[PDB]
Amino acid sequence: KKVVLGKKGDTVELTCTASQKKSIQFHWKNSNQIKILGNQGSFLTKGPSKLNDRADSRRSLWDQGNFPLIIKNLKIEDSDTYICEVEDQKEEVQLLVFGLTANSDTHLLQGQSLTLTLESPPGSSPSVQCRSPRGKNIQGGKTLSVSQLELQDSGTWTCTVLQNQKKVEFKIDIVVLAFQKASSIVYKKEGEQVEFSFPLAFTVEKLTGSGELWWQAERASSSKSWITFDLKNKEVSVKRVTQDPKLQMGKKLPLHLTLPQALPQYAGSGNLTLALEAKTGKLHQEVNLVVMRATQLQKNLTCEVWGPTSPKLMLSLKLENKEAKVSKREKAVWVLNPEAGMWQCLLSDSGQVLLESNIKVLP
Protein backbone atom coordinates (compact mmCIF):
# COMPACT_ATOMS: atom_id res chain seq x y z
CA LYS A 1 0.00 0.00 0.00
CA LYS A 2 1.20 3.54 0.69
CA VAL A 3 4.88 3.12 1.54
CA VAL A 4 6.38 6.54 2.13
CA LEU A 5 9.89 7.10 3.42
CA GLY A 6 11.09 9.83 5.72
CA LYS A 7 14.21 11.29 7.29
CA LYS A 8 15.08 11.40 11.00
CA GLY A 9 13.96 14.63 12.58
CA ASP A 10 12.70 15.75 9.17
CA THR A 11 8.93 15.60 8.69
CA VAL A 12 6.51 13.93 6.28
CA GLU A 13 2.96 14.25 5.13
CA LEU A 14 0.55 11.35 4.98
CA THR A 15 -2.18 11.82 2.51
CA CYS A 16 -5.79 11.03 3.04
CA THR A 17 -8.78 12.34 1.22
CA ALA A 18 -11.84 10.70 -0.30
CA SER A 19 -14.77 11.79 -2.47
CA GLN A 20 -17.50 13.86 -0.75
CA LYS A 21 -14.72 16.45 -0.08
CA LYS A 22 -16.58 18.16 2.81
CA SER A 23 -15.37 18.56 6.43
CA ILE A 24 -16.20 15.10 7.72
CA GLN A 25 -14.99 12.79 10.51
CA PHE A 26 -11.70 11.03 10.06
CA HIS A 27 -9.15 9.40 12.29
CA TRP A 28 -5.58 8.29 11.95
CA LYS A 29 -4.70 5.17 13.90
CA ASN A 30 -1.56 3.05 13.72
CA SER A 31 -1.55 -0.72 13.28
CA ASN A 32 -1.97 -0.83 17.07
CA GLN A 33 -5.41 0.67 16.66
CA ILE A 34 -4.33 3.71 18.59
CA LYS A 35 -5.65 7.07 17.48
CA ILE A 36 -2.91 9.43 16.42
CA LEU A 37 -5.20 12.42 16.01
CA GLY A 38 -8.83 12.96 15.07
CA ASN A 39 -11.48 15.61 14.69
CA GLN A 40 -14.68 17.04 16.08
CA GLY A 41 -15.55 20.08 13.98
CA SER A 42 -12.80 22.69 13.79
CA PHE A 43 -11.47 21.28 17.03
CA LEU A 44 -8.48 19.11 16.06
CA THR A 45 -7.64 16.31 18.48
CA LYS A 46 -4.84 13.76 19.08
CA GLY A 47 -4.34 10.55 21.02
CA PRO A 48 -2.44 8.99 23.99
CA SER A 49 -0.06 7.42 21.47
CA LYS A 50 3.66 8.13 21.70
CA LEU A 51 3.25 10.20 18.51
CA ASN A 52 1.02 12.73 20.28
CA ASP A 53 2.36 16.29 20.24
CA ARG A 54 4.37 15.77 17.08
CA ALA A 55 1.43 14.93 14.86
CA ASP A 56 -0.78 17.51 13.22
CA SER A 57 -3.41 17.89 10.50
CA ARG A 58 -4.21 20.92 8.34
CA ARG A 59 -7.64 22.20 9.32
CA SER A 60 -7.74 24.55 6.33
CA LEU A 61 -7.06 21.71 3.91
CA TRP A 62 -9.75 19.88 5.91
CA ASP A 63 -12.59 21.71 4.16
CA GLN A 64 -11.32 20.40 0.78
CA GLY A 65 -11.37 16.74 1.75
CA ASN A 66 -7.82 16.34 3.05
CA PHE A 67 -7.48 15.04 6.52
CA PRO A 68 -3.64 15.07 6.22
CA LEU A 69 -1.19 13.76 8.84
CA ILE A 70 1.92 15.81 9.51
CA ILE A 71 4.59 14.22 11.68
CA LYS A 72 7.31 16.58 12.87
CA ASN A 73 10.61 15.60 14.49
CA LEU A 74 10.60 12.12 12.96
CA LYS A 75 11.49 9.47 15.53
CA ILE A 76 13.07 6.39 13.91
CA GLU A 77 10.56 4.41 15.88
CA ASP A 78 7.74 6.09 13.96
CA SER A 79 8.12 3.43 11.30
CA ASP A 80 4.66 1.82 11.25
CA THR A 81 1.53 1.21 9.20
CA TYR A 82 -0.93 4.04 9.97
CA ILE A 83 -4.53 3.91 8.80
CA CYS A 84 -6.74 6.79 7.90
CA GLU A 85 -10.26 5.69 8.66
CA VAL A 86 -12.34 8.19 6.68
CA GLU A 87 -16.11 8.07 6.02
CA ASP A 88 -16.47 4.20 5.29
CA GLN A 89 -13.00 3.04 4.14
CA LYS A 90 -9.41 2.49 5.26
CA GLU A 91 -6.08 3.78 3.97
CA GLU A 92 -3.03 1.70 4.92
CA VAL A 93 0.26 3.68 4.97
CA GLN A 94 3.63 2.42 6.13
CA LEU A 95 6.13 5.18 6.86
CA LEU A 96 9.65 3.79 6.89
CA VAL A 97 12.25 6.28 8.08
CA PHE A 98 16.02 6.17 7.54
CA GLY A 99 19.13 8.01 8.67
CA LEU A 100 22.46 8.15 6.79
CA THR A 101 25.39 9.11 8.99
CA ALA A 102 29.14 9.42 9.22
CA ASN A 103 30.68 8.85 12.67
CA SER A 104 34.31 9.88 11.83
CA ASP A 105 33.15 13.47 11.43
CA THR A 106 34.77 16.89 12.32
CA HIS A 107 37.86 18.14 10.47
CA LEU A 108 38.70 15.41 7.95
CA LEU A 109 42.10 15.63 6.41
CA GLN A 110 43.33 13.41 3.62
CA GLY A 111 43.31 9.63 3.56
CA GLN A 112 41.61 9.20 6.89
CA SER A 113 38.70 7.07 5.78
CA LEU A 114 35.10 8.16 5.83
CA THR A 115 32.40 5.78 7.07
CA LEU A 116 28.66 5.80 6.36
CA THR A 117 26.47 3.66 8.57
CA LEU A 118 22.69 3.71 8.25
CA GLU A 119 19.61 3.73 10.53
CA SER A 120 16.46 1.94 9.41
CA PRO A 121 13.34 0.23 10.76
CA PRO A 122 14.43 -3.13 12.28
CA GLY A 123 12.69 -5.04 9.61
CA SER A 124 13.28 -3.54 6.19
CA SER A 125 16.27 -3.26 3.99
CA PRO A 126 18.00 -0.28 2.49
CA SER A 127 20.82 0.07 -0.07
CA VAL A 128 22.94 3.12 -0.39
CA GLN A 129 24.35 4.65 -3.57
CA CYS A 130 26.56 7.51 -2.47
CA ARG A 131 27.11 9.68 -5.51
CA SER A 132 30.20 11.84 -4.95
CA PRO A 133 30.41 15.62 -5.60
CA ARG A 134 32.61 14.52 -8.44
CA GLY A 135 32.19 11.14 -10.05
CA LYS A 136 32.47 7.72 -8.35
CA ASN A 137 29.01 6.17 -7.84
CA ILE A 138 30.16 4.53 -4.63
CA GLN A 139 27.45 2.19 -3.29
CA GLY A 140 27.15 -0.34 -0.48
CA GLY A 141 24.85 -1.91 2.14
CA LYS A 142 23.56 -0.76 5.54
CA THR A 143 27.02 0.67 5.51
CA LEU A 144 29.49 1.99 3.00
CA SER A 145 32.66 3.94 3.72
CA VAL A 146 34.86 6.02 1.43
CA SER A 147 38.49 4.73 1.50
CA GLN A 148 41.14 7.44 1.72
CA LEU A 149 39.67 10.75 0.72
CA GLU A 150 41.50 12.57 -2.10
CA LEU A 151 41.00 16.35 -2.40
CA GLN A 152 38.44 16.37 -5.27
CA ASP A 153 36.02 14.37 -3.16
CA SER A 154 35.46 17.51 -1.13
CA GLY A 155 31.98 18.97 -1.03
CA THR A 156 28.49 17.71 -0.94
CA TRP A 157 27.71 14.10 -1.70
CA THR A 158 24.26 12.67 -2.43
CA CYS A 159 23.76 9.13 -1.03
CA THR A 160 20.47 7.46 -1.81
CA VAL A 161 18.71 5.08 0.57
CA LEU A 162 16.93 2.66 -1.71
CA GLN A 163 14.18 0.60 -0.18
CA ASN A 164 11.18 -0.70 -2.13
CA GLN A 165 10.16 0.93 -5.41
CA LYS A 166 10.70 4.05 -3.30
CA LYS A 167 14.06 5.69 -2.46
CA VAL A 168 15.16 8.53 -0.19
CA GLU A 169 18.11 10.82 -1.02
CA PHE A 170 20.55 12.10 1.59
CA LYS A 171 22.82 15.17 1.49
CA ILE A 172 25.93 14.68 3.53
CA ASP A 173 28.81 17.17 3.35
CA ILE A 174 32.44 15.97 3.24
CA VAL A 175 35.35 18.36 3.03
CA VAL A 176 38.91 17.04 2.77
CA LEU A 177 41.56 19.34 4.22
CA ALA A 178 44.91 18.95 2.49
CA PHE A 179 47.92 20.18 -1.60
CA GLN A 180 47.39 21.22 -5.24
CA LYS A 181 50.57 19.50 -6.52
CA ALA A 182 52.39 16.17 -6.31
CA SER A 183 56.01 16.58 -7.36
CA SER A 184 56.94 20.18 -7.89
CA ILE A 185 60.13 20.53 -9.81
CA VAL A 186 62.49 23.47 -10.41
CA TYR A 187 65.32 23.53 -12.90
CA LYS A 188 67.89 26.23 -12.16
CA LYS A 189 71.62 26.93 -12.56
CA GLU A 190 74.55 27.61 -10.20
CA GLY A 191 73.41 31.03 -9.08
CA GLU A 192 69.74 31.52 -10.04
CA GLN A 193 67.78 32.43 -6.93
CA VAL A 194 65.39 29.46 -6.44
CA GLU A 195 61.81 29.71 -5.34
CA PHE A 196 59.30 26.95 -4.45
CA SER A 197 55.56 27.05 -3.94
CA PHE A 198 52.93 24.75 -2.51
CA PRO A 199 49.35 26.15 -2.14
CA LEU A 200 46.27 24.86 -0.23
CA ALA A 201 42.55 26.08 -0.26
CA PHE A 202 41.96 28.82 2.38
CA THR A 203 40.17 27.38 5.59
CA VAL A 204 39.92 28.77 9.12
CA GLU A 205 39.83 26.75 12.41
CA LYS A 206 41.52 27.21 15.77
CA LEU A 207 44.96 26.19 17.05
CA THR A 208 45.68 24.23 13.77
CA GLY A 209 49.01 23.52 12.09
CA SER A 210 52.70 22.90 11.64
CA GLY A 211 55.16 20.55 10.05
CA GLU A 212 58.37 20.69 8.07
CA LEU A 213 60.23 19.96 4.86
CA TRP A 214 62.86 17.18 4.66
CA TRP A 215 65.61 17.06 2.02
CA GLN A 216 67.81 14.39 0.51
CA ALA A 217 70.66 16.32 -1.01
CA GLU A 218 72.39 14.51 -3.87
CA ARG A 219 75.27 12.41 -2.55
CA ALA A 220 75.36 14.51 0.65
CA SER A 221 73.67 11.75 2.74
CA SER A 222 74.17 14.48 5.36
CA SER A 223 70.41 14.39 5.98
CA LYS A 224 68.32 15.63 8.91
CA SER A 225 68.69 18.84 7.02
CA TRP A 226 65.49 20.87 7.25
CA ILE A 227 63.29 23.85 8.09
CA THR A 228 60.39 23.77 10.59
CA PHE A 229 57.23 25.92 10.48
CA ASP A 230 54.12 26.68 12.55
CA LEU A 231 50.96 28.09 11.04
CA LYS A 232 47.80 29.78 12.38
CA ASN A 233 45.29 31.43 10.01
CA LYS A 234 46.96 33.61 7.36
CA GLU A 235 50.05 33.52 9.57
CA VAL A 236 53.06 31.24 9.10
CA SER A 237 56.34 31.29 10.93
CA VAL A 238 59.44 29.16 11.12
CA LYS A 239 59.33 27.20 14.30
CA ARG A 240 63.06 27.02 14.17
CA VAL A 241 65.67 25.10 12.23
CA THR A 242 66.79 26.07 8.66
CA GLN A 243 70.54 26.37 9.12
CA ASP A 244 72.68 24.92 6.35
CA PRO A 245 71.50 27.23 3.51
CA LYS A 246 69.87 30.63 3.98
CA LEU A 247 66.30 29.36 3.18
CA GLN A 248 63.83 32.10 3.84
CA MET A 249 60.17 31.64 4.40
CA GLY A 250 57.14 33.85 4.15
CA LYS A 251 54.92 35.45 6.72
CA LYS A 252 51.97 34.83 4.43
CA LEU A 253 49.87 31.70 3.89
CA PRO A 254 50.82 31.01 0.26
CA LEU A 255 54.18 29.48 1.39
CA HIS A 256 57.34 30.31 -0.59
CA LEU A 257 60.28 28.15 0.31
CA THR A 258 62.99 30.48 -0.94
CA LEU A 259 66.51 29.40 -1.87
CA PRO A 260 68.85 32.41 -2.13
CA GLN A 261 71.41 31.23 -4.76
CA ALA A 262 70.94 27.89 -6.57
CA LEU A 263 74.28 26.47 -5.55
CA PRO A 264 75.08 22.96 -6.91
CA GLN A 265 74.93 21.02 -3.60
CA TYR A 266 71.29 22.00 -3.09
CA ALA A 267 69.98 19.49 -5.59
CA GLY A 268 67.78 16.55 -4.75
CA SER A 269 64.36 15.39 -3.52
CA GLY A 270 62.27 16.52 -0.58
CA ASN A 271 58.97 15.95 1.14
CA LEU A 272 57.07 18.88 2.60
CA THR A 273 54.84 17.34 5.23
CA LEU A 274 51.94 19.42 6.55
CA ALA A 275 49.85 18.30 9.49
CA LEU A 276 47.06 20.29 11.13
CA GLU A 277 44.01 19.23 13.06
CA ALA A 278 40.84 19.24 14.98
CA LYS A 279 40.99 15.63 13.99
CA THR A 280 44.47 15.57 12.47
CA GLY A 281 46.12 13.86 9.55
CA LYS A 282 49.27 14.82 7.63
CA LEU A 283 49.53 16.11 4.09
CA HIS A 284 52.54 15.52 1.92
CA GLN A 285 53.72 16.95 -1.35
CA GLU A 286 57.00 16.30 -3.08
CA VAL A 287 59.78 18.82 -3.86
CA ASN A 288 62.85 18.56 -6.14
CA LEU A 289 65.75 20.78 -7.27
CA VAL A 290 68.21 20.45 -10.19
CA VAL A 291 71.26 22.61 -10.88
CA MET A 292 73.37 23.27 -13.98
CA ARG A 293 76.95 24.68 -13.86
CA ALA A 294 78.46 25.98 -17.11
CA THR A 295 82.10 26.84 -16.41
CA GLN A 296 85.20 26.87 -18.68
CA LEU A 297 88.19 25.37 -16.83
CA GLN A 298 90.99 27.35 -18.43
CA LYS A 299 91.23 27.61 -22.24
CA ASN A 300 89.02 24.47 -22.13
CA LEU A 301 85.45 24.08 -20.77
CA THR A 302 82.76 21.91 -19.12
CA CYS A 303 79.27 22.02 -17.61
CA GLU A 304 77.23 19.72 -15.37
CA VAL A 305 73.66 19.17 -14.17
CA TRP A 306 73.16 17.97 -10.61
CA GLY A 307 70.10 16.73 -8.78
CA PRO A 308 67.11 14.65 -9.93
CA THR A 309 67.89 14.19 -13.60
CA SER A 310 66.31 11.47 -15.76
CA PRO A 311 68.28 8.60 -17.38
CA LYS A 312 66.22 9.65 -20.42
CA LEU A 313 67.63 13.18 -20.68
CA MET A 314 70.50 14.58 -22.70
CA LEU A 315 73.06 17.35 -22.19
CA SER A 316 74.66 19.26 -24.98
CA LEU A 317 77.21 21.99 -25.43
CA LYS A 318 77.41 24.12 -28.52
CA LEU A 319 78.52 27.64 -29.27
CA GLU A 320 74.99 28.50 -30.50
CA ASN A 321 76.21 29.48 -34.00
CA LYS A 322 76.82 25.98 -35.28
CA GLU A 323 75.14 22.70 -34.23
CA ALA A 324 76.12 20.14 -31.51
CA LYS A 325 79.65 20.65 -30.25
CA VAL A 326 78.98 17.63 -28.00
CA SER A 327 75.73 15.78 -27.42
CA LYS A 328 75.26 13.09 -24.72
CA ARG A 329 73.15 11.38 -22.06
CA GLU A 330 74.69 12.29 -18.68
CA LYS A 331 75.22 14.98 -16.07
CA ALA A 332 78.86 15.92 -16.50
CA VAL A 333 79.87 16.47 -20.11
CA TRP A 334 82.99 18.26 -21.30
CA VAL A 335 84.03 20.20 -24.38
CA LEU A 336 87.83 20.43 -24.55
CA ASN A 337 89.06 23.25 -26.85
CA PRO A 338 86.20 25.72 -27.45
CA GLU A 339 86.01 28.60 -30.05
CA ALA A 340 84.65 32.06 -29.44
CA GLY A 341 80.86 32.20 -29.20
CA MET A 342 78.30 32.56 -26.40
CA TRP A 343 77.99 28.85 -25.65
CA GLN A 344 74.79 27.21 -24.45
CA CYS A 345 74.60 24.18 -22.18
CA LEU A 346 71.39 22.19 -22.71
CA LEU A 347 69.54 19.70 -20.51
CA SER A 348 66.24 18.20 -21.84
CA ASP A 349 64.50 14.76 -22.42
CA SER A 350 62.62 13.79 -25.59
CA GLY A 351 62.92 17.28 -27.12
CA GLN A 352 61.67 20.30 -25.13
CA VAL A 353 64.55 22.19 -23.55
CA LEU A 354 64.82 21.88 -19.81
CA LEU A 355 67.95 23.70 -18.60
CA GLU A 356 69.81 26.37 -20.56
CA SER A 357 72.95 28.12 -19.30
CA ASN A 358 74.92 30.57 -21.43
CA ILE A 359 78.65 31.37 -21.26
CA LYS A 360 81.32 32.86 -23.64
CA VAL A 361 84.83 31.70 -24.89
CA LEU A 362 87.68 34.17 -25.44
CA PRO A 363 90.25 33.66 -28.28
Side-chain angles (χ1 to χ4, degrees), residues 84-97:
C84 219
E85 279 189 354
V86 182
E87 201 42 25
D88 282 328
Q89 176 212 199
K90 304 173 69 168
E91 286 267 84
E92 254 180 285
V93 196
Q94 189 178 77
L95 184 71
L96 311 171
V97 231

Side-chain angles (χ1 to χ4, degrees), residues 182-188 190-212:
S183 193
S184 312
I185 260 190
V186 184
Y187 298 113
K188 291 294 175 183
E190 182 170 43
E192 302 164 355
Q193 181 222 175
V194 190
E195 223 251 66
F196 300 108
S197 217
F198 350 97
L200 276 190
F202 287 87
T203 45
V204 194
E205 157 58 40
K206 270 183 170 178
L207 339 163
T208 15
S210 54
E212 66 168 338

